[PDB]
Amino acid sequence: MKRTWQPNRRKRAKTHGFRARMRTPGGRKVLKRRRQKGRWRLTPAVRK
Amino acid sequence: AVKKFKPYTPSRRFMTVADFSEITKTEPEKSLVKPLKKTGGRNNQGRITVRFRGGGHKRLYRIIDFKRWDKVGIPAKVAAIEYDPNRSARIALLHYVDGEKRYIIAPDGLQVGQQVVAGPDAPIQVGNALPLRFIPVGTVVHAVELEPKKGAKLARAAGTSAQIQGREGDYVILRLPSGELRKVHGECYATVGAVGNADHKNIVLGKAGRSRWLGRRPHVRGAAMNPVDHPHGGGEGRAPRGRPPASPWGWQTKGLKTRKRRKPSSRFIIARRKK
RNA sequence: CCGAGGGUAGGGCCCGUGACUGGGGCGAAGUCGUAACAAGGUAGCUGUACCGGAAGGUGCGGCUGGAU
RNA sequence: UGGGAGAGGGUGGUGGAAUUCCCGGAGUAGCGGUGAAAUGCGCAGAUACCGGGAGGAACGCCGAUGGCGAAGGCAGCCACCUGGUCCACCCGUGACGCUGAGGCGCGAAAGCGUGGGGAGCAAACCGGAUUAGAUACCCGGGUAGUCCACGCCCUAAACG
RNA sequence: CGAUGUCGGCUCGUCGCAUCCUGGGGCUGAAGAAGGUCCCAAGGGUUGGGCUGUUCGCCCAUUAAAGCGGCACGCGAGCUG
RNA sequence: GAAUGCCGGCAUGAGUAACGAUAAAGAGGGUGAGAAUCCCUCUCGCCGUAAGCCCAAGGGUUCCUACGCAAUGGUCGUCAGCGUAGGGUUAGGCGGGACCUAAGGUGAAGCCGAAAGGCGUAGCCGAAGGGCAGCCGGUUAAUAUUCCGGCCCUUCCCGCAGGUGCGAUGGGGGGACGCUCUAGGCUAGGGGGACCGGAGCCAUGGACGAGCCCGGCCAGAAGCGCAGGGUGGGAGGUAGGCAAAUCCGCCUCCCAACAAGCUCUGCGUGGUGGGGAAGCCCGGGUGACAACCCCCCGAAGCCAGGGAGCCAAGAAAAGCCUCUAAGCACAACCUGCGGGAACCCGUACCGCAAACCGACACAGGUGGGCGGGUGCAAGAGCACUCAGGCGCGCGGGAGAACCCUCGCCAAGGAACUCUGCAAGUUGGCCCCGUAACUUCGGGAGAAGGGGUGCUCCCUGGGGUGAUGAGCCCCGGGGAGCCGCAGUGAACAGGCUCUGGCGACUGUUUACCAAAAACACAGCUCUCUGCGAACUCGUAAGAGGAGGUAUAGGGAGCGACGCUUGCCCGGUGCCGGAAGGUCAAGGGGAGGGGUGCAAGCCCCGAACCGAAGCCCCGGUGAACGGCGGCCGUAACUAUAACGGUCCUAAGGUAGCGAAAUUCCUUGUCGGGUAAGUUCCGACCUGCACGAAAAGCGUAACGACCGGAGCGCUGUCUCGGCGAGGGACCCGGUGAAAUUGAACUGGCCGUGAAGAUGCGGCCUACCCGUGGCAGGACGAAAAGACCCCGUGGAGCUUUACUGCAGCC
RNA sequence: GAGCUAGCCCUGGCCAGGGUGAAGCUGGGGUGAGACCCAGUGGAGGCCCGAACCGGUGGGGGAUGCAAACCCCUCGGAUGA
Numbered sequence A: 001m002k003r004t005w006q007p008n009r010r011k012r013a014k015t016h017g018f019r020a021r022m023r024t025p026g027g028r029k030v031l032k033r034r035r036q037k038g039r040w041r042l043t044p045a046v047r048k
Numbered sequence B: 001a002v003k004k005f006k007p008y009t010p011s012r013r014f015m016t017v018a019d020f021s022e023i024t025k026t027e028p029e030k031s032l033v034k035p036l037k038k039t040g041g042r043n044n045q046g047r048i049t050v051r052f053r054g055g056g057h058k059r060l061y062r063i064i065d066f067k068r069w070d071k072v073g074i075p076a077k078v079a080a081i082e083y084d085p086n087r088s089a090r091i092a093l094l095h096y097v098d099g100e101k102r103y104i105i106a107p108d109g110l111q112v113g114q115q116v117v118a119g120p121d122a123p124i125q126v127g128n129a130l131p132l133r134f135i136p137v138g139t140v141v142h143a144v145e146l147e148p149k150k151g152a153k154l155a156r157a158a159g160t161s162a163q164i165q166g167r168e169g170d171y172v173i174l175r176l177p178s179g180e181l182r183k184v185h186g187e188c189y190a191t192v193g194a195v196g197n198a199d200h201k202n203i204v205l206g207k208a209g210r211s212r213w214l215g216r217r218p219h220v221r222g223a224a225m226n227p228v229d230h231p232h233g234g235g236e237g238r239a240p241r242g243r244p245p246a247s248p249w250g251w252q253t254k255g256l257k258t259r260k261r262r263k264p265s266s267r268f269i270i271a272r273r274k275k
Numbered sequence C: 001c002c003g004a005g006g007g008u009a010g011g012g013c014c015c016g017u018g019a020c021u022g023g024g025g026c027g028a029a030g031u032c033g034u035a036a037c038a039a040g041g042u043a044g045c046u047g048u049a050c051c052g053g054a055a056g057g058u059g060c061g062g063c064u065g066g067a068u
Numbered sequence D: 001u002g003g004g005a006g007a008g009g010g011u012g013g014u015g016g017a018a019u020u021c022c023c024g025g026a027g028u029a030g031c032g033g034u035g036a037a038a039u040g041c042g043c044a045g046a047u048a049c050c051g052g053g054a055g056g057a058a059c060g061c062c063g064a065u066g067g068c069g070a071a072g073g074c075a076g077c078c079a080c081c082u083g084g085u086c087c088a089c090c091c092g093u094g095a096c097g098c099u100g101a102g103g104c105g106c107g108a109a110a111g112c113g114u115g116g117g118g119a120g121c122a123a124a125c126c127g128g129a130u131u132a133g134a135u136a137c138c139c140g141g142g143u144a145g146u147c148c149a150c151g152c153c154c155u156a157a158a159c160g
Numbered sequence E: 001c002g003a004u005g006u007c008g009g010c011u012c013g014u015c016g017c018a019u020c021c022u023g024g025g026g027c028u029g030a031a032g033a034a035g036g037u038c039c040c041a042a043g044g045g046u047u048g049g050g051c052u053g054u055u056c057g058c059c060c061a062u063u064a065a066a067g068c069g070g071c072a073c074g075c076g077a078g079c080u081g
Numbered sequence F: 001g002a003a004u005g006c007c008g009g010c011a012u013g014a015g016u017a018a019c020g021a022u023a024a025a026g027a028g029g030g031u032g033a034g035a036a037u038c039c040c041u042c043u044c045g046c047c048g049u050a051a052g053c054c055c056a057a058g059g060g061u062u063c064c065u066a067c068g069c070a071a072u073g074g075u076c077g078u079c080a081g082c083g084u085a086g087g088g089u090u091a092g093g094c095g096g097g098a099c100c101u102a103a104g105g106u107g108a109a110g111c112c113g114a115a116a117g118g119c120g121u122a123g124c125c126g127a128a129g130g131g132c133a134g135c136c137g138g139u140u141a142a143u144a145u146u147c148c149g150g151c152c153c154u155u156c157c158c159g160c161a162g163g164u165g166c167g168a169u170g171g172g173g174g175g176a177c178g179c180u181c182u183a184g185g186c187u188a189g190g191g192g193g194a195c196c197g198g199a200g201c202c203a204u205g206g207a208c209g210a211g212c213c214c215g216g217c218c219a220g221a222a223g224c225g226c227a228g229g230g231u232g233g234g235a236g237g238u239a240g241g242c243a244a245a246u247c248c249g250c251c252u253c254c255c256a257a258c259a260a261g262c263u264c265u266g267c268g269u270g271g272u273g274g275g276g277a278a279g280c281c282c283g284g285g286u287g288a289c290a291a292c293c294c295c296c297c298g299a300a301g302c303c304a305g306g307g308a309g310c311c312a313a314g315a316a317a318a319g320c321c322u323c324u325a326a327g328c329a330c331a332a333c334c335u336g337c338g339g340g341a342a343c344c345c346g347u348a349c350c351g352c353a354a355a356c357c358g359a360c361a362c363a364g365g366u367g368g369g370c371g372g373g374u375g376c377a378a379g380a381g382c383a384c385u386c387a388g389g390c391g392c393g394c395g396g397g398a399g400a401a402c403c404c405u406c407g408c409c410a411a412g413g414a415a416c417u418c419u420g421c422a423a424g425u426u427g428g429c430c431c432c433g434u435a436a437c438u439u440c441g442g443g444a445g446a447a448g449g450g451g452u453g454c455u456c457c458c459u460g461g462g463g464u465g466a467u468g469a470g471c472c473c474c475g476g477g478g479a480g481c482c483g484c485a486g487u488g489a490a491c492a493g494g495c496u497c498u499g500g501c502g503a504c505u506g507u508u509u510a511c512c513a514a515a516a517a518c519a520c521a522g523c524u525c526u527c528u529g530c531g532a533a534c535u536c537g538u539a540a541g542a543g544g545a546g547g548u549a550u551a552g553g554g555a556g557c558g559a560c561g562c563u564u565g566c567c568c569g570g571u572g573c574c575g576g577a578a579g580g581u582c583a584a585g586g587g588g589a590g591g592g593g594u595g596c597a598a599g600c601c602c603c604g605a606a607c608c609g610a611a612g613c614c615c616c617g618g619u620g621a622a623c624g625g626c627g628g629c630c631g632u633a634a635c636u637a638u639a640a641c642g643g644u645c646c647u648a649a650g651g652u653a654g655c656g657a658a659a660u661u662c663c664u665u666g667u668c669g670g671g672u673a674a675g676u677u678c679c680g681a682c683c684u685g686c687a688c689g690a691a692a693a694g695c696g697u698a699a700c701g702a703c704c705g706g707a708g709c710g711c712u713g714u715c716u717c718g719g720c721g722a723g724g725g726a727c728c729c730g731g732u733g734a735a736a737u738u739g740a741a742c743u744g745g746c747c748g749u750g751a752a753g754a755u756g757c758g759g760c761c762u763a764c765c766c767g768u769g770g771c772a773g774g775a776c777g778a779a780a781a782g783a784c785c786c787c788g789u790g791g792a793g794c795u796u797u798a799c800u801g802c803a804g805c806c
Numbered sequence G: 001g002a003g004c005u006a007g008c009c010c011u012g013g014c015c016a017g018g019g020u021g022a023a024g025c026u027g028g029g030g031u032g033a034g035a036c037c038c039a040g041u042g043g044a045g046g047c048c049c050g051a052a053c054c055g056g057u058g059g060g061g062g063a064u065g066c067a068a069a070c071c072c073c074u075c076g077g078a079u080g081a
């Protein structure tokens, strides 16, 4: 049947992407947190 | 006069439609329509704040002249009478000798080809707008301003009208469509006559889908829900109210008055409504 | 081929009969009230409507086949 | 052809009396009701009186024993639209008449549908009396309905 | 109770005997035929339907007879539900 | 040494289940160390509204080639979407950007919020909508509307010529719109041809034929032709379109009017440029100087912004055109022509799937377009087939039980069973024919029947064309032929009678309930006078509504028919300028502490003093409630009738052993041989009853009950047959579970149900197919139940707060 | 976190074929005029049958599955909520 992951590059960038994160107090904390942890990627890759 | 159907489907049994016989022009004035943002009952937060809304026919909004004192002394001719899906009344297109074109609410009896006019000197005639103080006592009026220059507010739905009962200083006494007796300022504009399409209320929607066309989504009884949802929720099997019948939000809904107490316009309501 | 009739299926009319049920007629001496005949003790009757154990009552309109 | 009388019909208007309610004044110990009462209403200011407003329904005197209509029925007053009818003249048609099974239409009140209206009245209903009882008569309340429009019902002591 | 699936039916049997039938007996208020009652006897047999989830029971038509109980109210790692 | 402990390693089950659609395979040749599995050929089967083709999303080199085979591939592997390496994606015209706006988002102005932030007009962003210029063919191992060839076109810059009051974010026009039905003319696509081209072919009894087989086109500028869309012309006035305006709007006059004209599309033609089969011979070459013609069918596509009808009344903004303002009129714009200029990103490949989403090369999920032919009434249905693509990545045997899917069955025919569950039956079309009841529509495909192929003959009307032939479409009559059987295969209702419930079409517990539940038109009550009520928000602000009482909120009831009684004492709600109680505050009789004193400081009675509560009324389609004991009639029985107690008032109409009735399988009647169900009745209704509506009701229902007919393997009662498994052989090879085990029966004993204790009995060792009685077999630290001063959802006249309201 | 699912918003797309035959309109009859009747035309509908598409009624299979909801047969809607 129809499952739950239905990939969509525009949905991915507009929801989880860098510019979505920077627009918001909670979003910036996510970026601040992921830098401190040393994540290689601060945001999910999506090809555009 | 409403129109019936033969029972060739279950729903056509009682479904009735308007005659549309007063309508003389079947598409709107392009220079006077604008698009109607459908809300679905949602507000700027995105929340349903009026339940059971949405999914109706697409509509264009016809700009209606609710002031009319815009153009004192400039007569206009009734060029067509058209259908407006944003209101129960029919609308009438006016061609001013000015060359300006406008829509008004169509009073009962108005004819394509007659001329109307607005102002203190206007003849007490169907379609004319005067300040209330210049209309003779006893006259039936519609599209009545409530405060001067603020816009026609009262008696606008199909078949409604207000009646001038008397005067008192700067104020006249109106019997509203509800039967309430209110003081309204004499400089408030109103149009002679009653609103047309009096047959509007005799329409039998006939089936569910007809309501769905109007943007009216299905309404769910409190008794049909669960206690998380409504004071009337729950119970094993069917159940009486079991408490004073209440809204989804707890307030009583069989008699509890809700007009604000100390409201300033109370000094101008003479008698509360009727039946 | 037609064909007595036999068969299958579906209708129409009539008759008999049926738990139970509806009022009807009749029946020397049952129970309840007293509606009508006198102004019958609220004049009567009437079409209709609602009501009441029951006769009846009441409303609306009509008649005199009503009294004094 | 020329005249007349008429609540004959239909539509639109509009006038005053009275009841009710609301407002303001003035005023105080009862009012109402009955066979007698009680219920009811009234010092939270009623009844009675004055001024004001809203609303519905019915039209006093004229009015008659009268008039009109085929019957049912029709009564303030104005206008329009319309029917029947009588009289005068002796002008026209030349038996074109009478009745009328079916048909069609009209048809008081009550009742019914869909809207509106709602003062007064009032089935049902409630209360107070009366009474052995009183699902009545009498009293105090009161909903349909009575009113309007449209559509049904088609009854009668629709009787001379 | 860190689980012993819990009515009935179907299927499949098996056992007890306080025996429904069939076999053998005594007593009889046993003439004969047919019964009654007790004794011995478990080898075999002990039907088909209507009704109800039913067990049971009632009923229809037969029968030599249409037995009563146990087996975790036998049997859901056999089925049904 | 134990924690259903934690991490890891390795066992057991076990050479066991399985190896992923039953569409299907066989052989020859090749390659190679090795071949059922790679490559080639021939034969066979499968898909063909797909299992073929083309886009879009998503994926991201998976594409092509060479070299490989450890691992990946459910087996094998020489193969591969795998490993290594090299190559491969080309645009002014296709898509997106340098254009426009939609919801929404963001947001100079502004508003609001402790901070963070929430709003917000214009503006900006935002597309699969608007707008905008490319078609056909060739070419590569791999790209092509991109490269090449042919024929076309767009914008920007500059210049020339002609023309003109030129000039815009401003004004206006246009853009610009629904649903159903649909005209004419075309086009795509298709069928046929005795005509045209073509390598051939003659078999096996016949045919050298009007024989068979193959193919008979695609693109194209101007012009022309056909068919359509769009569009009145002139003048005078003018106060409106937030400046102006010659434009638009409005008014008058003249003219034009199904038109024509002007303009814009489609189709045809068209200089020209392409393509071109079977068969044959090694993707190629030949055919071939290939031919490229005629008739018919014909779109849902095109002309298109077409036409008609209807109600639920159907985006915006730019491009575009027109008007004018500042300006500027050596300018500028328009038209024609010429030269120059034309950027950024995507382009491989998969794409109903082995490359996307499902942990897998997973019988599942995935939006748009094309989707050929014949026959069956039609059709995207069904069968078979084209083009094209496949035989589903373990096989070979055997022919047990048993399981699955499937075929048949003597006699019987629901006797099966909770239930005809399941499976039969019926089945398309044409014709005849069709009942109660009904809201007059329906019920209705009611029911029930007849017909159905092929040949010959005569004949009716339509479409194309020409009026004819030809082709094509609907028919009518007559005479015959064959079979068991003519919708001969495939796809394609079993019917009826009668209750309950719900009016109906709809909706729902994604994944155990589709229903009688929800919704529904309709009915009623109630709130709301507009800065409405109500809702969301601390607010600002939104929704309500660019609505206005024929409107909007809340609540119950639920089409329709006939109806909806009595109780206002309690609770709620509504009304009530009195009285009662009532907080802060006002008041300040009278008291108190301190000081030598002026003073300072504290307590405080009467009294004035809201809402709320008390109190007085109203109110049921507001919460709700609607009795008991005793007596009585000229047979008996039973009480129309009376007595008395209590209540706020004592259940009306209708209905009733009911979706409600305990006793109960009530009693009677019907149906049956027999009926705890069913249907009709009765009424001592445990415990119906009137909008938590009462009683009905045509039509409807994958609802639930009862009956009959038809027909059946459901059954008496089982038999046989088919294929896929199970079994055997080669390949690959799991799992839950498992204290260890050398793991028998009885009768006992034992913590009360023993392979493991006692006493007897029985028993050589080890497996394979099978069956499920036991191992209180496995699974899941029982959901029931209780316990815990454990938790959570829900309620209220529990407690105490808080929002909100007063 | 609404790429699953629920509702609404904006913008696009889809629904083979066949059947029934509402209003209206035309003609005819009828009438004082009407209502109305008949025929033809017409093409309405939460209308009928049935693919795609959307569903998930009954049964069987599956149950360490092809699948953590699938498969076969049958069945509901299919111009509309």
Ligand SMILES: CC[C@H]1OC(=O)[C@H](C)[C@@H](O[C@H]2C[C@@](C)(OC)[C@@H](O)[C@H](C)O2)[C@H](C)[C@@H](O[C@@H]2O[C@H](C)C[C@H](N(C)C)[C@H]2O)[C@](C)(O)C[C@@H](C)C(=O)[C@H](C)[C@@H](O)[C@]1(C)O
Binding pocket: E003, E005, F779, F780, G063
């Ligand atoms: C399909 C595959 C599933 O099997 C079933 O669904 C069967 C058909 C259930 O019976 C179904 C159906 C039914 C009627 O049992 C037959 C019902 O009783 C239970 C509740 O669920 C089972 C076996 C239930 O057991 C029963 O649970 C009972 C509470 C007690 C009983 N036993 C201890 C006595 C026990 O056997 C229970 C809980 O689901 C088992 C647990 C371990 C599971 O969750 C496992 C994982 C199952 O989901 C499953 C194997 O995947």
Ligand SMILES: [Mg+2]
Binding pocket: A001, A002, A003
């Ligand atoms: Mg899903």
Ligand SMILES: [Mg+2]
Binding pocket: A002
């Ligand atoms: Mg889907």
Ligand SMILES: [Mg+2]
Binding pocket: A008, A009, A010, A011
């Ligand atoms: Mg995307």
Ligand SMILES: [Mg+2]
Binding pocket: A010
């Ligand atoms: Mg996208």
Ligand SMILES: [Mg+2]
Binding pocket: A008, A010, A011
């Ligand atoms: Mg997106």
Ligand SMILES: [Mg+2]
Binding pocket: A011
């Ligand atoms: Mg999205």
Ligand SMILES: [Mg+2]
Binding pocket: A014, A015
């Ligand atoms: Mg976002």
Ligand SMILES: [Mg+2]
Binding pocket: A013, A014, A015, A016, A017, A018, A019, A020, A021
């Ligand atoms: Mg972002």
Ligand SMILES: [Mg+2]
Binding pocket: A025, F116
């Ligand atoms: Mg911050």
Ligand SMILES: [Mg+2]
Binding pocket: A040
């Ligand atoms: Mg790094």
Ligand SMILES: [Mg+2]
Binding pocket: A016, A021, A030, A031, A042, A043, A044
């Ligand atoms: Mg992140």
Ligand SMILES: [Mg+2]
Binding pocket: B003, B004, B005, B006, B012, B013, B014, B015, B016
């Ligand atoms: Mg109707």
Ligand SMILES: [Mg+2]
Binding pocket: B018, B019, B020, B021, B022, B023, B090, B197
């Ligand atoms: Mg109208």
Ligand SMILES: [Mg+2]
Binding pocket: B030
């Ligand atoms: Mg516009």
Ligand SMILES: [Mg+2]
Binding pocket: B037, B038, B039
């Ligand atoms: Mg809005």
